[PDB]
Each structure stands twice: as C-alpha cells, then as structure tokens.
Amino acid sequence: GSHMNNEDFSQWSVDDVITWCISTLEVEETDPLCQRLRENDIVGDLLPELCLQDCQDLCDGDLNKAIKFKILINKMRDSKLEWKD
Predict the structure, then answer these.
(1) Dist CA 77 CA 29 (whole Å)
(2) Distance between CA atoms of residues 48 and 46, nearest Å
(3) DSSP string covering 31-74
(4) What are the CB-based long-range contacts (under 8 Å, 24+) for 26-30?
(5) Domain spans of the chain?
(6) How far apart are CA 63 and CA 4, in angstroms?
(7) Which residues form the SAM domain?
(8) Under CATH, to which class is 1-85 assigned?
(9) Which of 84, 31, 85 has the alpha carbon at shortest distance from 62?
(10) What is the rounded (10 degree) CA torsion for 46, 9, 28, 40?
C-alpha cells in the first residue's frame, strides 16, 4: 500500500524532524522555529500525537503555523509518489 522505503519512525531524530519540517513548512533553517521544535523532543512516531494542541503550543501562537504543520505531517504519513492524473 505505502510500505516502500520511508525513513523508519524509529530512526527519526530531532535534527531530522526539524530540518525536514521547516524546509517544507514555511521558512528555512534560520528562524527560531528550530529552537522551539528542538526543545520539545518529539519523535516521528509521536508527530501524529502532537495534534493542533501540541503543534500550536510549539508556536508563539499562529494558526497558519500549526495548521500547515499538522497537515504536512498527514501527507508524509499517507506518502505521495505519483497517483495524481
């Protein structure tokens, strides 16, 4: 179904989640957004557990941040190779 390569949630670390997140969320690895995510040590297996609650908490208080954050995560879970015609 979706099992192909992935990065294995058991191998996802701080730098892994942060880097990929930021580089695909809004800005690059410059904004303090990295520091925030770094504080709350969360593994890739706990990402879907954060929800808009922990996500928004990870931000100063901006919907666009959390909303877009949790979303991008859903895409990474269901994966996306090439099924759009």
Answers:
(1) 23
(2) 6
(3) STHHHHHHHS---GGGHHHHHHHHHHHTSSS-HHHHHHHHHHHH
(4) 26/64, 26/65, 26/68
(5) 1-85
(6) 33
(7) 4-85
(8) mainly alpha
(9) 31
(10) 30
